[PDB]
Structure formats: structure tokens, C-alpha cells
Design a protein around this motif. Structure first.
Motif, PDB file in Angstrom:
ATOM      1  N   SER A  57     -11.806   3.165  -2.498  1.00  0.00           N
ATOM      2  CA  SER A  57     -10.759   2.176  -2.733  1.00  0.00           C
ATOM      3  C   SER A  57      -9.853   2.602  -3.882  1.00  0.00           C
ATOM      4  O   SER A  57     -10.320   3.140  -4.887  1.00  0.00           O
ATOM      5  CB  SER A  57     -11.371   0.805  -3.022  1.00  0.00           C
ATOM      6  OG  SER A  57     -10.367  -0.160  -3.282  1.00  0.00           O
ATOM      7  N   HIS A  58      -8.548   2.362  -3.730  1.00  0.00           N
ATOM      8  CA  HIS A  58      -7.600   2.735  -4.774  1.00  0.00           C
ATOM      9  C   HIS A  58      -7.589   1.748  -5.932  1.00  0.00           C
ATOM     10  O   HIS A  58      -7.264   2.132  -7.060  1.00  0.00           O
ATOM     11  CB  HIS A  58      -6.184   2.850  -4.206  1.00  0.00           C
ATOM     12  CG  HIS A  58      -6.013   3.958  -3.214  1.00  0.00           C
ATOM     13  ND1 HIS A  58      -5.983   5.287  -3.578  1.00  0.00           N
ATOM     14  CD2 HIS A  58      -5.824   3.932  -1.874  1.00  0.00           C
ATOM     15  CE1 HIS A  58      -5.802   6.033  -2.504  1.00  0.00           C
ATOM     16  NE2 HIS A  58      -5.702   5.235  -1.456  1.00  0.00           N
ATOM     17  N   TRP A  59      -7.919   0.484  -5.684  1.00  0.00           N
ATOM     18  CA  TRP A  59      -7.765  -0.563  -6.685  1.00  0.00           C
ATOM     19  C   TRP A  59      -9.101  -1.165  -7.095  1.00  0.00           C
ATOM     20  O   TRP A  59      -9.191  -2.354  -7.400  1.00  0.00           O
ATOM     21  CB  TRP A  59      -6.824  -1.652  -6.180  1.00  0.00           C
ATOM     22  CG  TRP A  59      -5.418  -1.184  -6.044  1.00  0.00           C
ATOM     23  CD1 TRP A  59      -4.792  -0.778  -4.900  1.00  0.00           C
ATOM     24  CD2 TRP A  59      -4.462  -1.045  -7.098  1.00  0.00           C
ATOM     25  NE1 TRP A  59      -3.497  -0.410  -5.178  1.00  0.00           N
ATOM     26  CE2 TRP A  59      -3.271  -0.565  -6.521  1.00  0.00           C
ATOM     27  CE3 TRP A  59      -4.494  -1.291  -8.474  1.00  0.00           C
ATOM     28  CZ2 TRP A  59      -2.123  -0.325  -7.273  1.00  0.00           C
ATOM     29  CZ3 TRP A  59      -3.356  -1.051  -9.217  1.00  0.00           C
ATOM     30  CH2 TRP A  59      -2.186  -0.573  -8.616  1.00  0.00           C
ATOM     31  N   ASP A  60     -10.144  -0.340  -7.165  1.00  0.00           N
ATOM     32  CA  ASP A  60     -11.475  -0.832  -7.487  1.00  0.00           C
ATOM     33  C   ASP A  60     -11.551  -1.166  -8.979  1.00  0.00           C
ATOM     34  O   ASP A  60     -10.540  -1.221  -9.685  1.00  0.00           O
ATOM     35  CB  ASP A  60     -12.538   0.177  -7.053  1.00  0.00           C
ATOM     36  CG  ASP A  60     -12.426   1.503  -7.775  1.00  0.00           C
ATOM     37  OD1 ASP A  60     -11.492   1.670  -8.584  1.00  0.00           O
ATOM     38  OD2 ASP A  60     -13.281   2.381  -7.535  1.00  0.00           O
ATOM     39  N   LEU A  61     -12.768  -1.417  -9.465  1.00  0.00           N
ATOM     40  CA  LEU A  61     -12.949  -1.856 -10.846  1.00  0.00           C
ATOM     41  C   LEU A  61     -12.413  -0.836 -11.849  1.00  0.00           C
ATOM     42  O   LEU A  61     -11.876  -1.213 -12.898  1.00  0.00           O
ATOM     43  CB  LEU A  61     -14.429  -2.157 -11.096  1.00  0.00           C
ATOM     44  CG  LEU A  61     -15.482  -1.064 -10.867  1.00  0.00           C
ATOM     45  CD1 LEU A  61     -15.684  -0.154 -12.077  1.00  0.00           C
ATOM     46  CD2 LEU A  61     -16.809  -1.679 -10.430  1.00  0.00           C
TER      47      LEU A  61
END
Ligand SMILES: CCCCCCCCCCCCC/C=C/[C@@H](O)[C@H](CO)NC(=O)CCCCCCCCCCCCCCC
Ligand SMILES: CS(=O)(=O)Nc1ccc(C(=O)NCc2ccc(Cl)cc2Cl)cc1
Ligand SMILES: CS(=O)(=O)Nc1ccc(C(=O)NCc2ccc(Cl)cc2Cl)cc1
Ligand SMILES: CCCCCCCCCCCCCCCC
Ligand SMILES: CCCCCCCCCCCCCCCC
Ligand SMILES: CCCCCCCCCCCCCCCC
Ligand SMILES: CCCCCCCCCCCCCCCC
Ligand SMILES: CCCCCCCCCCCCCCCC
Ligand SMILES: CCCCCCCCCCCCCCCC
Ligand SMILES: CCCCCCCCCCCCCCCC
Ligand SMILES: CCCCCCCCCCCCCCCC
Ligand SMILES: CCCCCCCCCCCCCCCC
Ligand SMILES: CCCCCCCCCCCC
Ligand SMILES: CCCCC
Ligand SMILES: [K+]
Ligand SMILES: [K+]
Ligand SMILES: [K+]
Ligand SMILES: [K+]
Ligand SMILES: [K+]
Lengths: 281, 276
Positions: free
Chosen positions: B80-84
Motif C-alpha cells: 500500500s502507498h498510504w500505509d502507516l
């Protein structure tokens, strides 16, 4: 006492560090909140499109499809238009785009839509930047000087008519307002309007492009002159001028914001001292 | 005469302007020389690959492929590009103004927040980067207090040892901040020796094309790797900030030396020709 101030300095740096660490955490969560969902709905509905052509053509090895897409995304970085109905192609390193490219290097905007691929182009890009970035800094400094003396002439006229029955340090407030207001018009509002028409962007994407560019963040998700559309060529040299003067403008604007933080830091640092020393009477 | 200095100023700016305009022209031709061919060979060998894929798989008609490539170009706009942790990275690329752009907001709200997050973060991070420069400066000042004591009780004395000192700054500086990290990127990221140094300079100058990104590829990374890169960036940006500033002062000196050399060449061509 030379180390007396150095201990006081390291105390200041470490607190700023932790505020930066915590400013990064807050921003990280706010972007993850804003961008995770729209990512998932798009990454699920792209697997939907995947299976529609995974099984509608079984005679493709289907282990070589995901290798095909790698070979397209790997080559899309160079800027390919791999189509049969459009196979004649404009160049990305032509007479004027490598001029654009050199601009993104010295300004450190670095959109990255066009980047060197040859080992020679990379070695020259390292040398071109180590020399060009300081060089362009002198130009941008003089542009800030010239644009400063123009506004100095402007407030010499405006701080004369607004002299009614007047304090010196309060009219400083009136001046910074007319700087922000006129500045946002000539360097944010008006150019974004021109980008909205010519580039076909939304009103938000244009201002988004303005801020991302003039702060030299330079994501490269939107680039003026980045499509093939028609380009009057009245257009692109005006944008060179916009950047040269717009970078000087945000350099002052960002610096102003920095001094505001300095003030707010002093006000909040003494407020905590107040809150402590009282502790409910 | 207030406008007498202002005309001297505009004459200074306009010459620097033309040096920049002419520096862009030299660079443009040199990049067009270096990158025009590599573009052609890739555009020809990507048409080779395209008609190769229709023949080696007769299954595929020529009409489905153009629909496939639109659906890929459409998907390149997001993936994922927008993970934590990557939105933490992203926030770093914003305030440092590196802005690799491999991760960029797509929602109208993420763009508005990015505008606000940058206008406040860039000045904020500047203070941190200023203190990091101060601290790292006083560390090296302690070092040259001890090194300008052993070389200044014997052979050739002051005002030429400035030159020796700044070389020590550049030499060790390139080791800790360019050479050593690029070696680590060469192993961990699998980059060539050139690409690593290329990444270092493009990142620490805050150009940040995004054509190479540390931690940007899908690889098992050790727990210590990405946080060490944050520390590298924090301290490396302070380093080129001084390095770029040094190079700026060199140009000032070279400008003075070349300005007076032209005065020399003129003053001799003058009273060589005055001799008839
Ligand atoms: C790597 C890309 C190549 C870029 C090279 C651009 C150099 C252009 C030729 C230098 C002379 C510029 C035109 C003359 C200006 C003078 O009338 C004026 C004083 O009268 N000098 C300056 O304003 C101050 C100008 C001083 C600027 C010196 C810039 C330092 C370049 C060092 C590169 C060394 C390469 C050696 C082979 C050329
Ligand atoms: C798709 S392309 O990349 O291959 N072709 C071109 C792309 C952009 C430009 C251009 O000049 N844009 C204005 C501009 C100027 C200087 C700077 Cl520093 C930044 C900017 Cl946005 C020209 C050709
Ligand atoms: C598709 S991805 O989102 O997963 N790509 C990533 C790329 C990089 C990182 C990361 O932490 N890099 C170290 C780093 C830190 C701060 C700054 Cl400013 C720059 C850099 Cl290179 C994470 C993800
Ligand atoms: C300093 C720049 C701040 C950006 C504010 C621009 C506001 C534009 C409003 C458009 C309607
Ligand atoms: C005076 C500066 C005007 C900038 C307009 C740029 C439009 C693109
Ligand atoms: C294609 C034309 C782009 C090149 C414009 C050159 C103008 C230099 C900056 C002028 C201000
Ligand atoms: C010295 C420490 C200063 C800490 C105060 C940080 C101020 C940030 C305020 C941001 C407002 C949004
Ligand atoms: C858009 C994000 C805004 C983040 C604002 C963070 C505020 C943090 C305030 C820190 C206060 C520290 C007090 C220290 C006084 C000695
Ligand atoms: C205190 C924290 C302030 C956080 C502000 C976040 C607002 C996002 C606006 C998006 C529209
Ligand atoms: C510093 C705070 C400036 C906030 C200005 C944000 C304007 C965005 C308008 C988008 C519609
Ligand atoms: C490997 C060669 C790197 C070249 C660095 C350029 C030094 C100036
Ligand atoms: C040394 C600086 C420490 C920075 C803390 C943030 C670490 C992020 C790594 C993500 C895994
Ligand atoms: C390995 C190829 C290196 C090419 C870069 C050298 C550039 C020469 C300087 C040009 C000055 C006009
Ligand atoms: C000692 C330099 C830290 C980054 C490798
Ligand atoms: K890409
Ligand atoms: K960038
Ligand atoms: K950048
Ligand atoms: K930058
Ligand atoms: K970029």
C-alpha cells in the motif's frame, strides 16, 4: 562560558526535533486518513479489470501479463506512448525540454517527469546541480532584491496617504497584509487561473500546482507544459518568468511564516510558564 | 542619488540573469546530446517489443492491446502507498521539499491539506535543519581546533591552511554523507555505484526527481534501515546546505577574479594599441 550557550542551544534543537517528529506523525495520520480509502477502492476495482482480461484471454500465459505490465511501467518512466493508432512521437529531450529539465535541476523543483537515463546524463546532472544550484541562488537573490525595492516604492506611497490623526509599529501590520493580498493575486491566483484554462486543470489542481512548484517541493504529478496540447509559446516563457519571480515570492512568504512560528513559540513557551505557576490558583 | 545604486543593482541582476540563461543553454544542449540517442534506441526497441507481443501471442488482437495500455496508464495515475509508515515518508518529502513524488495526494482534501501542511512544515523543518547545522558545525569546529594546532606548530603557516581545512571538510564530508551511505544503498537497494551517488546528490540537494527512492521498492527491509535514512537525510541536508553555500562563495571569488582579469586584458589591449 562557551559551552554554556551550546548546552542552551542543544536544548532548543532537541525540542524543535520532537516537535518536527510529532508534526510528521500528525500529518502522516491525516494523509493516511485522506488517501487510504480512495486507494483501496481503486486497487480493488483494478483487480476487477484485471480478471476481466485474465480469463477472457486464457491463451495468454497470464504469468507473462504481469511481466508485460512491468515492461510497460518500466518504459513509461521514459515517457513512452506505445500505441499503433499513435506511433509517431514527440521527443522528451528535444531542444526545449532539456532546457526545461535544466530548470528543474537548478531551481531544485525537480518535477521528475523527465530525468536522465544515461550514466553520462547522470554524472553531468550531478555536476550541473552542484554548480547550478548556487549560481541560480544568486539570481533568485537579486530577483528578491529587485522585487523588494519595487514594493518599497509602493509602500512609500501607501504609508503616506494612510497617515491620519498613526503609530509606526502598527502600520507594519498594514504593510504585510497588502504584501500577502497583492502577492497571492499576482503569483498564486492569476497564474492558476491561466493554468486552469490553458492546461485544462481544475481550480484546485492549479493552485495545488502553484504551491507545490513555488515551494520547490516539485512532486511532478502536474506540470505546466507537460502535455502536448497546443502551447501558444507565448505560454512557456511566461511560465519561466512566473517561476523566477514566484520562487522569490514564496521565499519571502515562507520566511514570514517562519518568523510567525518564532513569535507563536515565544507566546506558547511563556503561556506554559503561566499555566504552571498558577496551577489553579 | 537613490536611483544611482538601484541602477547598479539592476545591472548586477541582469548579468547574473544572462549567466543563468546561458548556463541553462549549455546544459540543455549537453543533456540533449546525452539523452536524445538513449531515447531513440528505447523508442525503437519498445515498438519491437509491441509487435513482438502480437506475434508471439496470436491470441491477442491488435484492438485489445490499446485498451490494455489505457487501463495501465490510468492505473499509473494511482499505482500500500498510504500505509502507516509511507504517509510518514510522504510528510517527510513535503517539509524537506525533496518531494520525490512517487507518493502524492489524489483526493481534493489530501491536496488542500498538503498545501497547508507544507506552508507550515517547511518553515518549521527549516528551524530543525538550522539547529542540526549549528550542532554539526560546532562538532567540526572542535575537530579543526585540534587539527589546526598540530599543523600550525611547524611547516608553512597561516592563510594557506584555510585551504587545507576546507579540503578536510569536503573529504571527510563526502565520506560520511556521500560515499559511506551510497555504499549501503548499493547493497541494500541493489543500485549501481553510480545510481547510489546519483540518489545521494539528487536527494540531499532537495532536487528529488524520484527516479530512485530509498525504501521505495518492494523488498524486505531491516528494521534499522529506514530510520537510519531519516537520520542520514536530517544530517545530510545540513551538509549540502553548507556545501552548496561554499560553492556559492567560490563563485563569488571566481567572479571577482574573472572580472579583474577582463580589466587586465582590456588595460593591455588598450595601451598596446595606443602604441602606434
Ligand atoms: C558545466 C556547465 C558549463 C557552464 C560554464 C558557464 C561559464 C560561462 C563562461 C564564463 C564567462 C561568462 C561571461 C563573462 C562574464 C564577465 O564579463 C563577467 C565580468 O565581466 N563575469 C561574471 O559576471 C561572473 C561569471 C563567472 C561564472 C564562472 C562559472 C564557473 C564555471 C566553472 C566550470 C569550469 C569548466 C571548465 C571548462 C569551461
Ligand atoms: C512534457 S516535457 O517535459 O517533455 N516538455 C516540456 C515540459 C515543460 C516545459 C516548461 O518549460 N514548463 C514551464 C517550466 C519552465 C521551467 C521550469 Cl524550472 C519549470 C516549468 Cl513547469 C517545456 C517543455
Ligand atoms: C511505495 S512506498 O510508499 O512504500 N515507498 C517508500 C519510499 C521511502 C520510504 C522511506 O521511509 N524512505 C526513507 C526516507 C525517509 C524520509 C524521506 Cl524525506 C525520504 C526517504 Cl527516502 C517509505 C516508502
Ligand atoms: C501564501 C499563499 C496562500 C495561498 C492562499 C491562496 C488562496 C486562493 C483562494 C482561491 C479562491
Ligand atoms: C507579474 C507576474 C505575472 C505572472 C503571471 C504568470 C502566468 C502564467
Ligand atoms: C519552448 C520555449 C521555452 C524557452 C523560453 C526561453 C525564455 C527564457 C526565459 C525568458 C524569461
Ligand atoms: C520552541 C518550541 C515551540 C513549540 C511551539 C510550536 C508551534 C506550532 C504551532 C502550530 C499551529 C498549527
Ligand atoms: C496541522 C498539524 C498541526 C500540529 C500542531 C502540533 C502542536 C504541538 C504543540 C507542542 C507544544 C509543546 C509545548 C512546549 C512548551 C515548552
Ligand atoms: C489541531 C489539528 C488540526 C488538524 C486539521 C485537519 C483539517 C483537515 C482539513 C481537510 C479539509
Ligand atoms: C497558512 C494557512 C493558509 C490556508 C489557506 C488554504 C487555502 C486553500 C483554499 C482551497 C479552496
Ligand atoms: C563514479 C563517478 C562519480 C563522479 C562524481 C563527480 C565528481 C565531481
Ligand atoms: C533517528 C531518527 C528516528 C526517526 C524515527 C522515525 C522512524 C521511522 C521508521 C519507519 C519504520
Ligand atoms: C562518462 C561520460 C561523462 C560525460 C560528462 C562530461 C561533460 C563534459 C563537460 C562539458 C562542458 C562543456
Ligand atoms: C554516519 C552517517 C550516517 C548515515 C549512514
Ligand atoms: K511511475
Ligand atoms: K521534487
Ligand atoms: K524538489
Ligand atoms: K527543493
Ligand atoms: K519529483
Amino acid at each position: 562560558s562557551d559551552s554554556a550557550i551550546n548546552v542552551m542551544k542543544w536544548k532548543t534543537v532537541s525540542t524543535i526535533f520532537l516537535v518536527v517528529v510529532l508534526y510528521l506523525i500528525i500529518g502522516a495520520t491525516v494523509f493516511k486518513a485522506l488517501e487510504q480509502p480512495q486507494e483501496i477502492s481503486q486497487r480493488t476495482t483494478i483487480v476487477i479489470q484485471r480478471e476481466k482480461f485474465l480469463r477472457a484471454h486464457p491463451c495468454v500465459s497470464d504469468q507473462e501479463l504481469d511481466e508485460l505490465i512491468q515492461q510497460i511501467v518500466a518504459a513509461i518512466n521514459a515517457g513512452i506512448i506505445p500505441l499503433g493508432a499513435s506511433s509517431n512521437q514527440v521527443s522528451h529531450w528535444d531542444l526545449g525540454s532539456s532546457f526545461f529539465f535544466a530548470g528543474t535541476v537548478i531551481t531544485t523543483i525537480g518535477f521528475g517527469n523527465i530525468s536522465p537515463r544515461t550514466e553520462g546524463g547522470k554524472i553531468f546532472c550531478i555536476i550541473y546541480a552542484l554548480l547550478g544550484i548556487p549560481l541560480f541562488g544568486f539570481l533568485l537573490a537579486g530577483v528578491g532584491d529587485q522585487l523588494g525595492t519595487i514594493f518599497g516604492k509602493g509602500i512609500a506611497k501607501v504609508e503616506d496617504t494612510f497617515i491620519k490623526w498613526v503609530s509606526q509599529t502598527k502600520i507594519r501590520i498594514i504593510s504585510t497584509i497588502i504584501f500577502i493580498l497583492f502577492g497571492c493575486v499576482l503569483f498564486v491566483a492569476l497564474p492558476a487561473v491561466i493554468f486552469k484554462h490553458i492546461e485544462g486543470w481544475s481550480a484546485l489542481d492549479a493552485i495545488y500546482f502553484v504551491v507545490i512548484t513555488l515551494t520547490t517541493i516539485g512532486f511532478g504529478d502536474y506540470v505546466a507544459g507537460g502535455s502536448d496540447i497546443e502551447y501558444l509559446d507565448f505560454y512557456k516563457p511566461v511560465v519561466w518568468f512566473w517561476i523566477l519571480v514566484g520562487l522569490a515570492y514564496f521565499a519571502a512568504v515562507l520566511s514570514m511564516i517562519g518568523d510567525w512560528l518564532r513569535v507563536i513559540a515565544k507566546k506558547t513557551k511563556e503561556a506554559v510558564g503561566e499555566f504552571r505557576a498558577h496551577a489553579a490558583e
